[PDB]
Design a protein around this ligand. Structure first.
Ligand code: SF4
Ligand code: SF4
Ligand code: SF4
Ligand code: SF4
Ligand code: FES
Ligand SMILES: [Ca+2]
Lengths: 905, 568, 146
C-alpha cells in the first residue's frame, strides 16, 4: 500500500493496521491496549492520529491507528496539534487516578506508562481531586498484584483468556472501578501466567521473585541466553546484579518464542543463586576436603587420570554441545557415554531419526500456530513442552481466524474474529494417560495407556493409508472416533503430529511417524514435532555415545578405574543404589558440575563448573536448531576466590594437562571449530552465532545499559580500588557498557531491548524488521538438518493391547511444569509452588486395595520401600499407577516401568 | 519565531555566492539548529572554497574551529552525504557578523584531507588534534604529531570503537614513560618537534615549552601540551545530557557558571526550550559574578609579576546561591537548580557597595604604576591581522581594535536587556592594553550586576517545558506526572531528538563554544568544546620570536589562559 | 441531548431541524427545565448518571466523565477553581464522536456543552477559590510560574 504520514510517503503492508505499520517504519505513536500478538481492540484510545480524506483535506478526523487499516493512498498525520493534544489528554486521564508510586514500584525504569507519559510530553498535573484506590490480591508465589497502578487497558485479560486460554483472570466491575484479577485470592493457574509481567504496561503484575532481590533495569547486566529448563529452546535475557542472577526476561525470537515464555523458564532460575553450589575445585583427602585453585586441580587430576588404566566419561543432556564434546575428547569416543538410560536413548534416537530422516518438515515454534489440525500422541505438552501447548492453542484459534478472513475482516481486528468464530475451532486430538491441560480446547481426548495410544496412532495411520500396518481388536466406538480423527486429518491442509520421548514409549513415536508418513503420502502439508526432555537432549543424541547402564557395567566390572561425570546427578537416569555402588567401587570419581548433587560425596575431585549464567555454549532444541547462549557475568568479579569455569574449559585444560603436562584454558571458538571438524552432523553450530572477533563498526556488543550505575562503589566494601573489567575472550560481548546495542545494528544476538524513549519490553518494536515479525537481520539460531528427500518406512511393530496383570503395576508418568525439571526443583521459589507428591490410583484399583484418597501407601522399587499419599485419578486406566516424574525420589526413568508390592503403609 | 528552530539558512548570501561560484551541485546544505549555514563540501573543492571565502567582499577571516567526527554509529543521517568520518571547519566573518560550517565527508579507509594551514595558520594545532583523536591524516601538514597523547600511544581516543574508561594501571608503563621523558634532555631530536643554539625545557597551569635560544634570544619555541588532558568530550559521549554539567564546570575552572552556560544553551536548542526571563537574568548574574572573579585573579597575578578578599566575597555570594565555591554545577536544562535564596539581594547589595573603592584601587595600582607601564607595553604585541589569523578572541582581539564581543554581536541569555559597554583597545595588543581592557570589563560587569539587582524579575527559575531537567522539585514530590518525568530524566536521561546545536558565548578568557550532535538518544553523540586558551597558546610561537625569555614569561602571564582550558 | 432555550421552542420536532439547531431529536420525549432549577446541579446529576453508567471500556469516558463530575461537584459547593470551565470545555471537545469507543460519551457531553453555551454565568458563579494543586513543602522554594 501507500500511506502519507506528515507529508512523507511510505510503502506499508495493506493488511496491517496503521499503528503497527507506522511503528514498523520507525514512527512513534503512543499505545497501551494494542499488542502485536493480541490484535487490536481500541480500548485505551491512546494511538490517535488524524486521518484526512484525501491530499487536499484540511479538517481531518481523529482515528485510532490500531483500528484503522493501512489501505492504499491513506493520508494521516501523527504530529498534528489536535492529535498530540488528544494523546496528551489520554495520558492525563490515565494519570488522574495513578498512584504516587514510581520509587517503590518494580516497573520503574521499565514502565511503558512512564515512557508514554514522557513521550506525549505530559508533565504538569492540574487534576486536584481524590484518586481511586484498590485492594490487591495474592496471586501466588510468582506474580505480585498492585491494582492501583492499572490503566484499564485489558491487555492482561486478553492475553490470559483469549491468547493463553486461562480461565481464572477476568475483569470485574464497572464504569471506572474496573478491577483485573482473579475472582478470589489464590495462585494463578496458567502455565503462562508469568508473561503478565511483560504484557501489563504498568506495575500491576510484577515478578515477585525479582521483587524479593530487586534492582532497576539500568543496573542489570544482561546477556542473550537459552532457557535451560526444557527442550524447546526459548530465548531469554538473564539479568544479574551483584553476582547473582536477578531476573529472566523474555528475549524476542520471531522464529521460536516470540513474546512469551512459560513459568518454568521464567521463574525456575533460582538454582543459580543457591549457596551450596561448588565455587572452587575440591579434592578429598581421607575425610578432609582440600580446596584447590585451577592449576593445582588440573595437575592433580591429570596425574591421577594418567595413572589410571581406563577413564570413561558420562555426559548429560543438561550440558552444552561443547562440554559434552570436550568430555568425549578427554576420554575418547569409545569411552564416552551419554548419561541417560538405554530406553531413554532409544526413544531419543528414534525421535532424531524421524526428525532428520523422515522426510517431513519439523516446524519452528512460531510456525506451529499456522497448522490446521493437531494430533498429540502421548506427550503431555503443557507440563513438558509448554510453549508448544501455547502455539497449539493459537493453531486451534486459526479456524476462527480463517472464518473471519472469509468475511473480509482484517486479521488484527481480534474482537470481530472471536465474534465470528464463536466456538468453532480447528481439530485437536490429544492422547495421554490422564487428563491434559489441553482438554478444554481439544476436539477429543484419549485417556489410555501408552500401548493403547500407540495402537490408536497405528489405527489412524492405517485408516489414512492402507499400506500402513493394521490394528486388530479395535472396539466399534473407538473405531468411530478413529474415523472422526481420520476425517479431520484428511480434510486438513496442514496437519501437525506432535509426539515426544516423555511418554516413555517407543511405539508412540513409531505411531506418530506412521501417521505423519500416511499424511505425507496423501499429499498433505504435514509437519511433525518431537518433544525431548532436557535443554540439550537433541544435541547429546546427535553426538551419541553409550548408555548410562553400559558405563555402570564398565565401572562395576572393574574395566574402568576412573570416571568423569559431567553435569549429571545420575539418579534421574539409573537406580540410585546401583549408581552409588558403581561410584563407590570406582577408585577415581571426578564430577564437573555447577549444582551440589548427591554423587559428590563419592567424588574424589569436584570441579566447580559454571551454570548457563556463568558459561557460554551451544544447545540443540527439540526441532534441531543450534542456539548459542552467552555468559551473563564473571563469577570471580565480586568474589575473587571463586574458580567457576566452563565445563568445556575445565575438560579441555584437563585434556591438555593429561597430554602435554601444561594447562590450556582455551577459547570457545576453538572448541566450536573442533566440534565442526570432528562431528560433521554438528557442523551447523558454527553459524549459530558469530565468533569472538565479530564487531559492529569496530566495537563489541554491550551486556549492560549505558546508564549502568555504581561502577566505583559496587565493590567498594571489598576494596576501594576498582578491579579490572572482566575480559571476555570467548564471545563477542563485553562485560561493560562500552559496546553496541543499537536496534539498527547488523546482528541477531540482542542482550536486551532498549531504545531512547522506549524503556519497557515494548522496546522490542525497534529491534524487528516489522513489529510482531522476525528480528531485524534475522532471528538467531540455525537448523542443523534440512528436511530429507525421502522418508522412512512404516513401522510394522504394532504393540498389543495393555493387559493389567495382578501384582504388577505399570507406572504412568505424570509430569509437572513445576517439579519435573531437576534444576527447576532446586529453585527455592518452586518449593511453595510444586504440589505434594501424590500417587495416582484408579477408583477400582484403590477399591481393590481398600485405599481411600489420602491414605499413604508404600511401594518397593529397586529394593526401596517409599510411601506416598494416594490421589484418586478417574481418567487413569485400571492396572496403571500414576507417579510424578522427576520429583523427590521418583526418577523419569521409572516412566513405563513396572511396580511391585504396592500395599497400604 | 523561535531561536532554536531548525533552519536551513538558504537566505544567507554566502549560500548564493557559493552557488554562483561552484555551482548548485557542488555542495549540500544541511538544516541544523546550530544557527549557522552547514555546507557539505567535496574534499577536492575544500581549498577552493577556503580561498573563495577568504576573498569575499566581507571575508570570512577567522577559522573558529576545526575538528573531526566519527559518523559510523550515527543512525539519523537523513539529508547528509554518505560519510564514515567528517571534518567540520567553523569559519567566522566579523564584517558580516556571520559564520559558516564546512563539513567534509570521508570514507573509513581513505581518511586524509588537504591541510588548511596555508589558509588559516591556526589550523595547525586543530589538525594535529584531529589526527590525534580521530586518525584523520592531513596532507601537506608540516609536523602531524599527537598533541594530546604521548607519541607512543596506540589508537585514536575519540573514535567510537575506543574504550573510554581507564585501563589497568601498570608500573612497567610508568617506568617506561619515566625513561622516555627523563632521557628527553639527553637524547633530544630537533626534527620531530618541527624545529631545525641551545635547547631548554621550562617545565595558569604546568606545561612544558621546548625553547631554542641564541644566547638569551628565543629563535624557536614549540609548546608541549596535553599534560592536562581529561577527555572531557569522550565523557560527553558517556554521560547523559543532565549528568554532564559538572564536567562542563571543570573546564576553565575559574569560569564555573560561565562554562556551564554554552552547554545548557546548546542543550536547550536541542530540546526546543525557551527559558523565561528570570532564568536569563539569573544565569547572566552568576556568569558576571564569575567573570569578575576571573578578571580579579588575572589582574592580581599580572600585578604580582589584598586582591584575594574580593574573590572571597564573590565566593561567599556564590556559596550562598549555589552551595559551592568554584564548581557550582548549578545551571540546568531549562533553568537553574534552585531558586535564589531569600537574602541574596542583601549580599549582592553589600558586594556592590564594596567594589567601587576596590576598583578605584586597582586602577590606581595599574595606571599610576609607570614601572608596570614600561615593563608591560610593547611586550609581545600583535595587531588585528595576527589576531584574526590565529583565532585570538576576548581581550586580545578587542585590544587590537576589533569590536567583536558575543554578548553584543550575537546576544544570548537575555544580554540585550542590559546596558553595558564593550571596551575596545587602540589597535595593539600589549600586556598593558589587555590588562586595562580587563579592568574596564570588570567595571562593565559591575554595571550589569547593578542593573540585575535594581530590576529583578519575579517568576520561575525553571521553564514550563516537558524536557526541563529536572522538573521543579515540589511538583516532583507531589504530582505523579512530574514524578514520572523526574524518574526518567534522572535515570535513563532526557531524550533530545536528533539534531545538531551550537552555542558560542564570551567566556572569561575569550570565546567558548559547545557544538553538540544528538542521535536522538539520552547521551551526546558528539560534544565538541572550543576553548579560547587553545588558540591563545597556539599564538605564542608567532609573537615571541626574537624576544627574551623574560618577555616570554611576561607574555605567558598576560595571555590569560588556563591549562585545563587548553587541554579540555 | 443538548439543552435548547425558549428561542428554539418554535422549531419542528424533526431530525434535521433539531440537528441544525445544535442538538438531537433523540427519542422526542422532551424534558422542560424551569427557572428555579440550577443548571450546574442538573448537569451534575446528568454527568453522575453518565459516569456511573459508563461501561469502563475506553479511557475518555471512563476517566474523563468522573473528572467532569468532580468539577461540577466543586462548582456546586462553590469550591470551583480557575481552569475548571476550560477543563469542561476541553472534555466536551475531546469526548466527541470518534474519540470514544461508542456513542455514550458524546451523548454524555452534549448537555454539558449546551449548558455551558447557554448558561455560562452559573458555571462562572461556581468558581470562588484560587487555583491550588500543590502544598508548600518546607525547604523547597516553588517554581512561581507566570
Ligand atoms: S506503574 Fe509505572 S507510572 Fe505507575 S507507579 Fe509504577 S513505574 Fe510509576
Ligand atoms: S492490569 Fe495491566 S494489563 Fe491489565 S488492564 Fe490493567 S494496566 Fe492493562
Ligand atoms: S517452554 Fe521450555 S524452553 Fe521455553 S520457557 Fe518453558 S521451560 Fe524454558
Ligand atoms: S464511551 Fe462507550 S465504550 Fe467508552 S467506556 Fe463509555 S460506555 Fe464504554
Ligand atoms: S492502542 Fe489503539 S486504542 Fe489502544
Ligand atoms: Ca566465558
Amino acid at each position: 500500500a501507500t500511506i502519507h504520514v506528515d507529508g512523507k510517503e511510505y510503502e506499508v503492508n495493506g493488511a496491517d493496521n496503521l499503528l503497527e505499520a507506522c511503528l514498523s517504519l520507525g514512527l512513534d505513536i503512543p499505545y497501551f491496549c494494542w499488542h502485536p500478538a493480541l490484535g487490536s481492540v481500541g480500548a485505551c484510545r491512546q494511538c490517535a492520529v488524524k486521518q484526512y480524506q484525501n491530499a487536499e483535506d484540511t479538517r481531518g478526523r481523529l482515528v485510532m491507528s490500531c483500528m484503522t487499516p493501512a489501505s492504499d493512498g491513506t493520508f494521516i498525520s501523527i504530529d498534528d496539534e489536535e492529535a498530540k493534544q488528544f494523546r496528551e489528554s489520554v495520558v492525563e486521564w490515565l494519570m488522574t487516578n495513578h498512584p504516587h508510586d514510581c520509587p517503590v514500584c518494580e516497573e520503574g525504569g521499565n514502565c511503558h506508562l512512564q515512557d508514554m507519559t514522557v513521550m506525549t510530553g505530559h508533565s504538569f498535573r492540574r487534576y486536584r481531586f481524590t484518586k481511586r484506590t484498590h485492594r490487591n490480591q495474592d496471586l501466588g508465589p510468582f506474580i505480585s498484584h498492585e491494582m492501583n497502578r492499572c490503566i484499564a487497558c485489558y491487555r492482561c485479560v486478553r492475553y490470559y483468556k483469549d491468547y493463553a486460554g486461562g480461565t481464572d483472570l477476568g475483569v470485574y466491575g464497572a464504569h471506572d472501578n474496573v478491577y483485573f484479577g482473579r475472582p478470589e485470592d489464590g495462585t494463578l493457574e496458567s502455565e503462562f501466567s508469568g508473561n503478565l509481567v511483560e504484557i501489563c504496561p504498568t506495575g500491576v503484575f510484577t515478578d515477585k521473585t525479582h521483587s524479593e532481590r530487586y534492582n532497576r533495569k539500568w543496573d542489570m547486566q544482561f546477556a542473550p541466553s537459552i532457557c535451560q529448563q526444557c527442550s524447546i529452546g526459548c530465548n531469554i535475557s538473564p539479568g544479574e546484579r551483584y553476582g547473582e542472577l536477578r531476573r529472566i526476561e523474555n528475549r524476542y525470537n520471531g522464529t521460536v518464542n516470540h513474546y512469551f515464555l512459560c513459568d518454568r523458564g521464567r521463574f525456575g532460575y533460582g538454582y543459580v543463586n543457591l549457596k551450596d553450589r561448588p565455587r572452587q575445585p575440591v579434592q578429598r583427602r581421607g575425610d578432609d576436603f582440600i580446596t584447590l585453585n585451577a592449576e593445582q586441580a588440573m595437575q592433580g587430576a591429570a596425574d591421577i587420570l594418567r595413572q589410571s588404566k581406563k577413564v570413561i566419561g558420562i555426559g548429560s543432556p543438561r550440558a552444552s554441545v561443547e562440554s559434552n564434546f570436550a568430555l568425549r575428547e578427554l576420554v575418547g569416543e569409545e569411552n564416552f557415554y551419554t548419561g541417560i538410560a538405554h530406553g531413554e536413548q532409544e526413544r531419543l534416537q528414534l525421535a532424531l531419526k524421524v526428525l532428520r530422516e523422515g522426510g517431513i518438515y519439523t516446524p519452528a515454534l512460531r510456525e506451529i500456530e499456522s497448522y490446521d489440525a493437531v494430533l498429540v500422541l502421548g506427550e503431555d505438552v503443557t507440563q513438558t513442552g509448554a510453549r508448544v501447548a501455547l502455539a497449539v492453542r493459537q493453531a486451534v484459534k486459526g479456524k476462527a481466524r480463517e472464518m473471519a478472513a472469509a468475511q473480509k475482516v482484517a486479521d488484527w481486528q481480534i474482537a470481530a474474529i472471536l465474534n465470528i468464530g464463536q466456538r468453532a475451532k480447528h481439530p485437536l486430538f490429544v492422547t495421554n494417560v490422564d487428563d491434559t491441560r489441553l482438554d478444554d480446547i481439544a476436539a477429543w481426548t484419549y485417556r489410555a495407556p501408552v500401548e493403547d495410544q500407540a495402537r490408536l496412532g497405528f489405527a489412524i495411520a492405517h485408516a489414512l493409508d492402507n499400506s500402513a500396518p493394521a490394528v486388530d481388536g479395535i472396539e466399534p466406538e473407538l473405531q468411530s472416533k478413529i474415523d472422526v480423527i481420520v476425517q479431520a486429518l484428511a480434510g486438513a491442509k496442514k496437519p501437525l503430529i506432535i509426539s515426544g520421548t516423555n511418554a516413555g514409549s517407543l511405539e508412540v513415536i513409531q505411531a506418530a511417524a506412521n501417521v505423519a508418513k500416511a499424511l505425507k503420502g496423501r499429499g498433505a502439508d504435514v509437519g511433525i514435532t518431537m518433544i525431548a526432555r532436557s535443554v540439550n537432549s537433541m544435541g547429546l543424541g546427535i553426538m551419541g555415545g553409550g548408555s548410562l547402564e553400559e558405563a555402570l557395567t564398565e565401572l562395576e566390572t572393574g574395566r574402568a578405574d576412573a570416571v568423569v561425570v559431567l553435569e549429571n546427578d545420575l539418579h534421574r537416569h539409573a537406580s540410585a543404589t546401583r549408581v552409588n555402588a558403581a561410584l563407590a567401587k570406582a577408585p577415581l570419581v571426578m564430577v564437573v558440575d555447577h549444582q551440589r548433587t548427591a554423587i559428590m560425596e563419592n567424588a574424589h575431585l569436584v570441579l566447580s563448573a559454571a551454570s548457563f549464567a556463568e558459561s557460554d555454549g551451544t544447545v540443540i532444541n527439540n526441532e534441531g536448531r543450534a542456539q548459542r547462549f552467552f555468559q551473563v557475568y564473571d563469577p570471580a568479579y565480586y568474589d575473587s576466590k571463586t574458580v567457576m569455569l566452563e565445563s568445556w574449559r575445565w575438560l579441555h585444560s584437563l585434556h591438555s594437562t593429561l597430554l602435554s603436562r601444561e594447562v590450556d584454558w582455551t577459547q570457545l571458538d576453538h572448541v566450536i571449530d573442533a566440534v565442526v571438524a570432528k562431528i560433521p552432523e554438528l557442523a551447523g553450530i558454527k553459524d549459530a552465532a558469530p565468533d569472538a572477533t565479530f564487531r559492529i563498526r569496530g566495537q563489541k556488543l554491550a551486556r549492560e545499559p549505558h546508564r549502568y550505575s555504581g561502577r566505583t562503589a559496587m565493590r567498594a566494601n571489598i576494596s576501594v580500588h576498582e578491579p579490572r573489567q572482566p575480559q571476555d575472550i570467548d564471545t563477542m560481548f563485553t562485560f561493560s557498557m562500552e559496546g553496541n546495542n543499537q536496534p539498527t545494528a547488523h546482528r541477531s544476538q540482542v542482550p536486551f531491548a532498549w531504545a531512547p524513549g522506549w524503556n519497557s519490553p515494548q522496546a522490542w518494536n525497534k529491534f524487528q524488521d516489522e513489529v510482531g515479525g522476525k528480528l531485524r537481520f534475522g532471528d538467531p539460531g540455525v537448523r542443523l538438518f534440512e528436511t530429507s528427500e525421502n522418508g522412512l518406512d512404516y513401522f510394522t511393530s504394532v504393540p498389543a493391547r495393555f493387559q493389567p496383570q495382578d501384582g504388577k503395576w505399570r507406572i504412568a508418568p505424570y509430569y509437572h511444569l513445576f517439579g519435573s525439571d531437576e534444576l527447576s526443583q532446586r529453585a527455592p521459589v518452586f518449593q511453595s509452588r510444586m504440589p505434594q507428591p501424590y500417587i495416582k490410583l484408579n477408583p477400582a484399583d484403590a477399591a481393590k486395595l481398600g485405599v481411600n484418597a489420602g491414605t499413604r501407601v508404600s511401594f518397593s522399587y529397586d529394593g526401596n520401600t517409599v510411601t506416598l499419599p494416594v490421589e484418586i485419578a478417574e481418567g487413569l486406566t485400571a492396572g496403571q499407577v500414576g507417579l510424578p516424574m522427576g520429583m523427590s525420589g521418583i526418577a523419569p526413568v521409572l516412566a513405563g516401568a513396572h511396580l511391585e508390592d504396592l500395599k497400604e503403609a | 519565531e523561535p531561536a532554536w528552530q531548525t533552519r536551513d539558512h538558504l537566505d544567507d548570501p554566502v549560500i548564493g555566492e557559493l552557488r554562483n561560484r561552484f555551482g548548485p551541485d557542488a555542495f549540500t546544505v544541511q538544516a541544523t539548529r546550530t544557527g549557522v549555514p552547514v555546507v557539505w563540501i567535496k574534499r577536492e573543492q575544500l581549498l577552493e572554497v577556503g580561498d573563495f571565502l577568504k576573498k569575499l567582499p566581507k571575508p570570512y577571516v577567522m577559522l573558529f574551529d576545526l575538528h573531526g567526527m566519527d559518523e559510523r554509529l550515527r543512525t539519523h543521517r537523513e539529508g547528509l552525504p554518505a560519510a564514515d568520518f567528517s571534518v567540520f571547519y567553523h569559519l567566522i566573518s566579523i564584517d558580516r557578523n556571520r559564520d559558516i560550517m564546512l563539513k567534509v565527508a570521508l570514507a573509513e579507509n581513505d581518511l586524509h584531507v588537504p591541510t588548511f594551514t596555508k589558509l588559516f595558520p591556526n589550523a595547525n594545532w586543530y589538525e594535529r588534534e584531529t589526527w590525534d583523536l580521530f586518525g584523520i591524516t592531513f596532507d601537506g601538514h608540516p609536523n602531524l604529531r599527537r598533541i594530546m597523547m604521548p607519541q607512543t600511544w596506540k589508537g585514536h581516543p575519540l573514535r567510537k570503537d575506543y574504550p573510554a574508561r581507564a585501563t589497568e594501571f601498570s608500573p612497567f608503563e610508568l617506568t617506561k614513560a619515566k625513561q622516555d621523558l627523563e632521557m628527553e634532555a639527553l637524547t633530544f631530536k630537533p626534527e620531530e618537534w618541527g624545529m631545525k643554539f641551545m635547547f631548554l625545557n621550562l617545565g595558569h597551569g604546568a606545561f612544558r615549552i621546548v625553547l631554542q635560544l641564541d644566547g638569551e634570544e628565543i629563535v624557536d619555541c614549540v609548546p608541549d601540551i596535553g599534560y592536562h588532558h581529561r577527555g572531557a568530550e569522550k565523557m560527553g559521549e558517556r554521560q547523559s545530557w543532565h549528568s554532564y554539567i559538572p564536567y562542563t564546570d571543570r573546564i576553565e575552572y575559574l569560569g564555573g557558571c560561565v562554562n556551564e552556560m554554552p552547554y545548557v544553551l546548546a542543550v536547550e536548542k536541542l530540546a526546543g526550550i525557551t527559558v523565561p526571563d528570570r532564568v536569563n537574568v539569573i544565569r547572566v548574574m552568576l556568569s558576571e559574578l564569575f567573570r569578575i572573579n576571573s578578571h580579579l585573579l588575572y589582574i592580581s597575578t599580572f600585578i604580582q609579576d589584598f586582591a584575594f578578599t574580593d574573590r572571597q566575597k564573590i565566593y561567599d555570594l556564590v556559596e550562598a546561591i549555589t552551595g559551592f565555591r568554584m564548581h557550582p554545577a548549578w545551571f540546568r536544562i531549562g533553568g537553574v537548580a534552585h531558586d535564589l535564596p531569600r537574602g541574596w539581594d542583601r549580599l549582592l547589595r553589600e558586594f556592590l557597595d564594596w567594589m567601587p573603592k576596590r576598583l578605584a584601587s586597582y586602577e590606581k595600582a595599574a595606571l599610576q604604576n609607570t614601572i608596570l607601564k614600561g615593563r608591560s607595553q610593547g611586550v609581545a604585541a600583535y595587531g588585528a591581522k595576527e589576531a584574526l589569523e590565529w583565532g585570538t578572541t576576548g581581550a586580545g582581539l578587542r585590544a587590537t581594535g576589533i569590536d567583536f564581543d558575543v554578548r553584543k554581536a550575537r546576544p544570548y541569555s537575555g544580554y540585550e536587556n542590559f546596558d553595558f559597554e564593550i571596551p575596545v583597545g587602540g589597535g595593539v595588543s600589549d600586556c598593558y592594553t589587555r590588562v586595562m581592557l580587563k579592568v574596564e570589563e570588570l567595571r562593565q560587569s559591575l554595571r550589569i550586576l547593578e542593573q540585575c539587582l535594581n530590576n529583578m524579575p519575579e517568576g520561575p527559575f525553571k521553564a514550563d517545558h516537558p524536557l526541563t531537567t529536572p522538573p521543579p522539585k515540589e511538583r516532583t514530590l507531589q504530582h505523579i506526572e512530574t514524578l514520572i518525568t523526574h524518574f526518567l530524566q534522572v535515570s535513563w536521561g532526557p531524550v533530545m531528538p536528533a539534531n545538531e546545536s551550537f552555542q558560542m558565548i564570551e567566556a572569561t578568557k575569550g570565546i567558548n563554544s559547545y557544538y553538540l550532535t544528538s542521535d536522538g538518544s539520552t547521551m551526546s553523540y558528539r560534544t565538541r568544546i572550543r576553548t579560547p586558551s587553545y588558540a591563545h597558546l597556539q599564538q605564542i610561537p608567532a609573537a615571541i620570536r626574537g624576544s627574551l625569555v623574560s618577555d616570554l614569561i611576561v607574555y605567558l602571564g598576560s595571555i590569560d589562559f588556563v591549562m585545563s582550558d587548553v587541554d579540555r | 441531548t443538548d439543552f435548547l432555550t425558549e428561542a428554539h421552542l418554535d422549531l419542528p420536532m424533526e431530525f434535521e431541524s433539531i440537528g441544525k439547531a445544535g442538538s438531537r431529536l433523540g427519542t422526542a420525549l422532551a424534558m422542560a427545565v424551569d427557572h428555579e432549577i440550577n443548571m450546574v446541579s442538573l448537569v451534575r446529576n446528568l454527568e453522575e448518571f453518565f459516569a456511573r453508567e459508563s461501561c469502563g471500556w475506553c479511557t475518555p469516558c471512563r476517566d474523563g466523565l468522573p473528572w467532569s463530575v468532580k468539577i461540577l461537584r466543586a462548582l456546586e459547593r462553590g469550591e470551583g477553581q480557575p481552569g475548571d470551565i476550560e477543563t469542561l470545555e476541553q472534555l466536551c471537545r475531546f469526548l466527541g464522536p470518534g474519540k470514544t469507543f461508542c456513542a455514550h460519551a458524546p451523548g454524555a457531553v452534549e448537555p454539558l456543552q449546551s449548558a455551558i453555551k447557554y448558561f455560562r454565568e452559573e458555571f462562572e458563579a461556581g468558581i470562588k477559590q484560587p487555583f491550588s494543586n500543590t502544598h508548600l513543602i518546607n525547604g523547597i522554594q516553588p517554581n512561581l510560574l507566570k
